[PDB]
């Protein structure tokens, strides 16, 4: 089962937790700190896109330190670049993720409130570093037995660049469909923080209902679902969309009215539906920002600005990775991981 999982002398006792495209995660015993950790094997070097997501996660996570964000406490790889085929990343061990919880567990308002807070608290740190996660969703939210939440997988994360956000209509995207903001299908590259707030809103809705709020089955169908609930965008909102093919598509649509949140979520806290509304606002300029969300009445019993830390060192203009070849991406992954080598 546990294939070629070659963590050195330090980590023993492996258990298969899960898999993915180009890697595997197992639990293991840290014979140094005596604590049982999580280790993720990565085999990305064949594809440039994988090397690009591996490099992004490592640069960022090594520079981040926050309780609601997953850490990288160690990295294991071959001593030379020629010999390095895989990379192992040691990270926090968490019992489950939110995606698995929503399948079998119904969350109490208290849990929804607490999970939401921790997501926003950690998102604040990320955004304060001028970084967008860009792939927030239930499966990227980890929980332990005492319901501590940590955000993971920054393979899609980018440095904010709102000046280069505008793009054409139905422009290709990578992040998960159900949690994709409307503007992504319209005129946005997803380079503004408002992208994350939308996903978090979709996650809030899903926590109230245990099912996706906008479960589109393909690219354009995603927009249909969102507009089916939010209704036709106002004139003022349409004017913010200057692209003609995007505006005209929205104009070609029949008028639809807003479907009441309380109609969708009968048992839901009204304070929760009010915030949900602010998060799932069509216009990304009007959409609530992370610090407003934290200060929202629904999260009153947790809100504490001084206990909600921001990044010490924010990333500057984007990392320029989209350009470099696999070969150069492997070197950068090599040099970024050097510090964890005993020969260092
Ligand atoms: O980076 C992590 N996961 C990303 C996306 O979620 C990933 C999963 C597979 C893969 F093949 C890749 Cl490339 C990326 C991660 C999870 C845990 C992690 N601690 N404790 C438990 C886990 C865990 C929970 C559920 C499922 C898994 Cl599998 C692991 C650490 N780090």
Coordinates of C-alpha atoms and ligand atoms in Angstrom, one line a residue:
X1 CA 0.0 0.0 0.0
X2 CA 2.5 2.6 1.2
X3 CA 4.6 2.6 -2.0
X4 CA 8.1 4.0 -2.2
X5 CA 7.7 6.3 0.8
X6 CA 11.3 6.7 1.8
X7 CA 11.3 9.1 4.7
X8 CA 14.7 8.8 6.3
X9 CA 15.8 7.6 9.8
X10 CA 13.7 10.3 11.5
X11 CA 10.2 9.3 10.6
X12 CA 8.7 5.8 11.1
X13 CA 5.3 4.0 11.4
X14 CA 3.5 5.1 8.3
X15 CA -0.2 5.0 7.6
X16 CA -1.9 5.9 4.3
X17 CA -4.1 8.9 4.7
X18 CA -4.8 9.8 1.1
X19 CA -3.6 10.4 -2.4
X20 CA -3.8 12.8 -5.3
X21 CA -2.5 13.7 -8.8
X22 CA 1.3 13.6 -8.2
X23 CA 1.7 12.7 -4.6
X24 CA 0.6 10.8 -1.4
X25 CA 0.1 11.8 2.2
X26 CA 0.9 9.4 5.1
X27 CA 1.0 9.7 8.9
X28 CA 4.3 8.9 10.6
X29 CA 6.1 9.1 13.9
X30 CA 8.6 11.9 14.4
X31 CA 11.3 10.1 16.4
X32 CA 12.9 13.4 17.2
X33 CA 10.0 15.4 18.6
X34 CA 8.2 12.2 19.5
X35 CA 5.0 13.7 17.9
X36 CA 3.2 11.9 15.1
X37 CA 3.3 14.0 11.9
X38 CA 1.9 14.1 8.4
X39 CA 4.2 13.6 5.4
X40 CA 3.4 14.3 1.8
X41 CA 5.4 12.7 -1.0
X42 CA 5.5 14.7 -4.2
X43 CA 6.5 13.4 -7.7
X44 CA 6.0 16.5 -9.9
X45 CA 9.3 16.9 -11.8
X46 CA 8.0 15.3 -15.0
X47 CA 5.4 18.1 -15.6
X48 CA 6.2 21.8 -15.4
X49 CA 2.7 22.6 -14.1
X50 CA 3.4 20.3 -11.1
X51 CA 6.8 21.8 -10.5
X52 CA 5.1 25.2 -10.5
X53 CA 2.5 24.3 -7.9
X54 CA 5.1 22.5 -5.7
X55 CA 7.4 25.6 -5.8
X56 CA 4.6 28.0 -5.0
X57 CA 3.5 26.0 -2.0
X58 CA 7.0 25.7 -0.6
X59 CA 8.1 29.3 -0.9
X60 CA 4.9 30.5 0.7
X61 CA 4.4 27.9 3.5
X62 CA 8.1 28.3 4.6
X63 CA 7.4 32.0 4.9
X64 CA 4.1 31.8 6.6
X65 CA 3.4 31.1 10.3
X66 CA -0.2 30.9 11.5
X67 CA -2.3 28.5 13.5
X68 CA -5.1 28.3 10.9
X69 CA -2.6 27.7 8.0
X70 CA -0.8 24.4 7.5
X71 CA 3.0 24.5 8.1
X72 CA 6.1 23.0 6.7
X73 CA 8.3 21.8 9.6
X74 CA 10.6 19.7 7.5
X75 CA 11.4 18.6 3.9
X76 CA 13.1 15.4 2.8
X77 CA 14.8 15.0 -0.6
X78 CA 17.9 13.5 -2.2
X79 CA 21.2 15.4 -1.5
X80 CA 21.8 16.1 -5.2
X81 CA 19.4 17.3 -7.9
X82 CA 20.3 14.4 -10.2
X83 CA 19.2 12.0 -7.5
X84 CA 16.0 13.9 -6.5
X85 CA 13.0 12.2 -8.0
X86 CA 10.5 12.9 -5.2
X87 CA 10.1 15.5 -2.4
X88 CA 8.6 14.9 1.0
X89 CA 7.0 17.7 3.0
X90 CA 6.4 17.3 6.7
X91 CA 3.3 19.0 7.9
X92 CA 0.7 19.2 10.7
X93 CA -1.2 16.0 11.3
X94 CA -5.0 16.5 11.3
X95 CA -7.7 13.8 11.7
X96 CA -10.0 14.9 8.9
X97 CA -10.8 17.6 6.3
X98 CA -14.1 19.5 5.9
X99 CA -15.1 17.8 2.7
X100 CA -15.2 14.5 4.5
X101 CA -17.1 16.0 7.4
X102 CA -19.9 17.4 5.4
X103 CA -20.7 14.0 3.9
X104 CA -21.6 12.4 7.2
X105 CA -21.8 15.1 9.9
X106 CA -24.4 17.8 10.4
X107 CA -22.7 20.9 11.9
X108 CA -24.2 22.9 14.7
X109 CA -24.4 26.6 14.4
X110 CA -21.6 26.8 17.0
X111 CA -19.4 24.6 14.7
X112 CA -20.3 26.6 11.6
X113 CA -19.5 29.8 13.5
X114 CA -16.2 28.4 14.8
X115 CA -15.0 26.9 11.5
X116 CA -15.9 30.1 9.6
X117 CA -14.0 32.2 12.1
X118 CA -10.8 30.1 11.8
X119 CA -11.0 30.2 8.0
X120 CA -11.4 34.0 8.0
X121 CA -8.7 34.4 10.6
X122 CA -6.2 32.4 8.5
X123 CA -7.4 34.0 5.3
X124 CA -6.7 37.4 6.8
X125 CA -3.1 36.4 7.4
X126 CA -2.8 35.2 3.8
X127 CA -4.3 38.3 2.3
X128 CA -2.1 40.5 4.5
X129 CA 0.8 38.9 2.8
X130 CA -0.6 40.1 -0.5
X131 CA -1.3 36.4 -1.3
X132 CA -4.4 34.8 -2.8
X133 CA -5.1 31.1 -2.1
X134 CA -7.2 30.8 -5.2
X135 CA -8.5 27.3 -4.4
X136 CA -10.4 27.5 -1.1
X137 CA -12.8 24.6 -0.7
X138 CA -13.8 22.0 1.9
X139 CA -11.2 19.4 1.0
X140 CA -8.5 22.1 1.5
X141 CA -9.6 22.7 5.0
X142 CA -8.2 20.3 7.6
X143 CA -9.6 19.7 11.1
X144 CA -8.2 17.8 14.1
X145 CA -10.1 16.1 16.9
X146 CA -10.5 19.3 18.8
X147 CA -11.8 21.1 15.7
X148 CA -8.8 23.2 15.0
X149 CA -8.9 24.4 11.4
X150 CA -5.9 24.8 9.1
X151 CA -5.9 25.8 5.4
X152 CA -3.7 23.7 3.2
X153 CA -2.5 23.3 -0.4
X154 CA -1.1 26.6 -1.7
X155 CA -0.3 25.1 -5.1
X156 CA -2.5 27.6 -6.9
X157 CA -1.7 30.6 -4.7
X158 CA -0.6 33.8 -6.4
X159 CA 0.5 37.2 -5.3
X160 CA -2.3 39.7 -5.7
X161 CA -2.2 41.8 -8.9
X162 CA -5.5 43.7 -9.2
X163 CA -4.0 45.9 -12.0
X164 CA -3.7 42.9 -14.3
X165 CA -7.0 41.3 -13.4
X166 CA -9.2 42.1 -16.4
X167 CA -9.4 39.4 -19.1
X168 CA -11.9 38.3 -21.8
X169 CA -15.2 36.4 -21.5
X170 CA -15.2 32.7 -20.6
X171 CA -11.4 32.8 -20.1
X172 CA -9.9 29.5 -19.0
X173 CA -9.4 28.9 -15.3
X174 CA -8.0 26.2 -13.0
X175 CA -9.5 26.6 -9.5
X176 CA -12.4 24.4 -8.4
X177 CA -15.6 25.1 -10.3
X178 CA -18.2 25.1 -7.5
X179 CA -16.3 27.7 -5.7
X180 CA -15.4 29.9 -8.7
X181 CA -16.5 33.5 -8.4
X182 CA -18.8 34.8 -11.2
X183 CA -16.3 37.3 -12.5
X184 CA -14.0 34.5 -13.3
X185 CA -16.3 33.4 -16.1
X186 CA -16.9 37.0 -17.2
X187 CA -13.8 39.3 -17.1
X188 CA -11.4 38.3 -14.3
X189 CA -8.1 36.4 -14.1
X190 CA -8.6 36.0 -10.3
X191 CA -5.8 38.3 -9.2
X192 CA -7.8 40.1 -6.5
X193 CA -8.5 39.0 -2.9
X194 CA -12.2 39.1 -3.6
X195 CA -11.8 35.7 -5.3
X196 CA -11.1 34.0 -1.9
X197 CA -14.0 35.7 -0.2
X198 CA -16.4 34.2 -2.7
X199 CA -15.2 30.7 -2.2
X200 CA -15.4 31.1 1.6
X201 CA -19.0 32.2 1.0
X202 CA -19.7 29.0 -1.0
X203 CA -18.1 27.1 1.9
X204 CA -20.4 28.9 4.4
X205 CA -23.5 27.9 2.4
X206 CA -22.3 24.3 2.1
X207 CA -21.7 24.2 5.9
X208 CA -25.4 25.2 6.4
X209 CA -26.7 22.7 4.0
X210 CA -24.1 19.9 3.7
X211 CA -24.5 20.3 -0.1
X212 CA -22.8 22.7 -2.6
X213 CA -24.7 26.0 -3.2
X214 CA -23.6 26.3 -6.9
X215 CA -22.9 22.7 -8.1
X216 CA -22.3 23.4 -11.8
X217 CA -21.5 20.4 -14.0
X218 CA -19.4 22.4 -16.4
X219 CA -17.8 25.8 -17.1
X220 CA -20.7 28.0 -18.1
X221 CA -23.2 26.1 -16.1
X222 CA -21.4 27.4 -13.0
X223 CA -22.5 31.0 -13.9
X224 CA -26.1 29.8 -14.4
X225 CA -26.3 28.4 -10.9
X226 CA -24.9 31.6 -9.3
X227 CA -27.3 33.8 -11.3
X228 CA -30.2 31.5 -10.6
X229 CA -29.9 32.3 -6.9
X230 CA -28.5 35.9 -6.9
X231 CA -30.8 36.9 -9.8
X232 CA -30.1 39.4 -12.5
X233 CA -27.2 41.8 -11.8
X234 CA -28.2 45.4 -11.3
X235 CA -27.5 48.1 -13.9
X236 CA -24.9 49.6 -11.6
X237 CA -23.1 46.2 -11.4
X238 CA -23.3 45.7 -15.1
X239 CA -21.7 49.0 -15.7
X240 CA -18.7 47.7 -13.8
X241 CA -18.4 45.0 -16.5
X242 CA -17.0 46.9 -19.5
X243 CA -16.3 43.8 -21.7
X244 CA -19.0 43.6 -24.3
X245 CA -19.2 39.9 -24.8
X246 CA -19.5 39.5 -21.0
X247 CA -22.1 42.2 -20.6
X248 CA -24.1 41.2 -23.7
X249 CA -24.3 37.6 -22.5
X250 CA -25.7 38.8 -19.2
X251 CA -28.0 41.2 -21.1
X252 CA -29.2 38.3 -23.3
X253 CA -30.6 36.6 -20.2
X254 CA -34.2 36.7 -19.0
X255 CA -34.7 38.8 -15.8
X256 CA -34.5 36.6 -12.6
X257 CA -35.2 37.7 -9.0
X258 CA -33.0 37.0 -6.0
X259 CA -33.8 33.7 -4.2
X260 CA -34.1 34.5 -0.5
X261 CA -31.2 33.0 1.6
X262 CA -33.7 32.1 4.4
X263 CA -35.7 30.4 1.7
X264 CA -32.6 28.2 0.9
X265 CA -31.5 27.8 4.5
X266 CA -34.7 27.7 6.7
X267 CA -33.0 26.7 9.9
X268 CA -30.0 29.0 9.4
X269 CA -28.9 31.8 11.8
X270 CA -30.1 35.1 10.4
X271 CA -26.7 36.7 11.3
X272 CA -25.1 33.9 9.2
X273 CA -27.3 34.5 6.2
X274 CA -26.6 38.2 6.4
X275 CA -22.9 37.6 6.2
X276 CA -23.3 34.9 3.6
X277 CA -25.1 37.5 1.6
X278 CA -22.1 39.9 1.9
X279 CA -19.7 37.2 0.9
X280 CA -21.7 36.0 -2.1
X281 CA -22.1 39.5 -3.5
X282 CA -22.0 39.5 -7.3
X283 CA -20.0 42.7 -7.6
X284 CA -16.4 42.0 -6.4
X285 CA -15.9 45.6 -5.5
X286 CA -18.9 45.6 -3.2
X287 CA -18.1 42.1 -1.8
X288 CA -17.2 42.0 1.8
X289 CA -13.5 41.9 2.6
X290 CA -11.9 39.5 5.1
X291 CA -11.5 42.0 8.0
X292 CA -15.1 43.1 7.6
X293 CA -16.2 39.5 7.7
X294 CA -14.4 38.8 10.9
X295 CA -16.0 41.9 12.5
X296 CA -19.4 40.8 11.4
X297 CA -21.9 40.3 14.3
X298 CA -22.2 36.6 13.5
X299 CA -18.6 36.1 14.6
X300 CA -18.9 38.4 17.6
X301 CA -18.0 35.8 20.2
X302 CA -14.6 35.1 18.5
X303 CA -13.7 38.4 16.9
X304 CA -10.6 39.9 18.4
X305 CA -8.3 42.0 16.1
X306 CA -5.3 41.9 18.3
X307 CA -5.5 38.1 18.3
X308 CA -5.8 38.0 14.6
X309 CA -2.2 38.4 13.3
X310 CA -1.0 39.6 9.9
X311 CA 2.0 38.6 7.9
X312 CA 5.4 40.0 8.9
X313 CA 6.9 39.8 5.4
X314 CA 4.4 40.2 2.5
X315 CA 5.3 38.8 -0.9
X316 CA 6.0 41.4 -3.6
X317 CA 5.2 41.2 -7.3
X318 CA 4.4 37.8 -8.6
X319 CA 7.1 35.1 -8.5
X320 CA 7.4 34.8 -12.3
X321 CA 7.0 31.0 -12.3
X322 CA 4.5 30.7 -15.2
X323 CA 7.5 31.2 -17.6
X324 CA 10.4 29.0 -16.5
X325 CA 10.9 25.4 -17.7
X326 CA 10.7 22.2 -15.6
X327 CA 14.5 22.1 -15.4
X328 CA 14.8 25.6 -13.8
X329 CA 11.8 24.9 -11.6
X330 CA 13.5 21.8 -10.3
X331 CA 16.6 23.8 -9.4
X332 CA 14.6 26.4 -7.5
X333 CA 12.7 23.7 -5.7
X334 CA 16.2 22.3 -4.9
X335 CA 17.6 25.5 -3.5
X336 CA 14.5 26.4 -1.5
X337 CA 14.7 23.0 0.2
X338 CA 18.4 23.1 1.0
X339 CA 18.0 24.6 4.4
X340 CA 16.5 21.4 5.7
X341 CA 19.5 19.3 4.6
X342 CA 21.7 18.1 7.4
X343 CA 24.8 19.1 5.4
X344 CA 23.6 22.6 5.8
Ligands
LIG1 O1 -1.0 19.2 1.1 C1 -1.9 18.5 1.6 N1 -2.9 18.1 0.8 C2 -3.0 18.5 -0.6 C3 -4.5 18.9 -1.0 O2 -5.4 18.6 0.1 C4 -2.6 17.3 -1.5 C5 -3.1 16.0 -1.2 C6 -2.6 14.9 -2.0 C7 -1.7 15.1 -3.0 F1 -1.3 14.1 -3.8 C8 -1.2 16.4 -3.3 CL1 0.0 16.7 -4.6 C9 -1.6 17.5 -2.5 C10 -1.8 18.0 3.0 C11 -2.7 17.3 3.7 C12 -2.2 17.1 5.0 C13 -2.8 16.3 6.1 N2 -2.4 16.4 7.3 N3 -3.2 15.6 8.2 C14 -4.1 14.9 7.4 C15 -3.9 15.3 6.1 C16 -4.8 14.8 4.9 C17 -6.2 14.9 5.1 C18 -7.0 14.4 4.0 C19 -6.5 13.9 2.8 C20 -5.1 13.9 2.7 CL2 -4.3 13.2 1.3 C21 -4.2 14.3 3.8 C22 -1.0 17.7 5.0 N4 -0.7 18.2 3.8

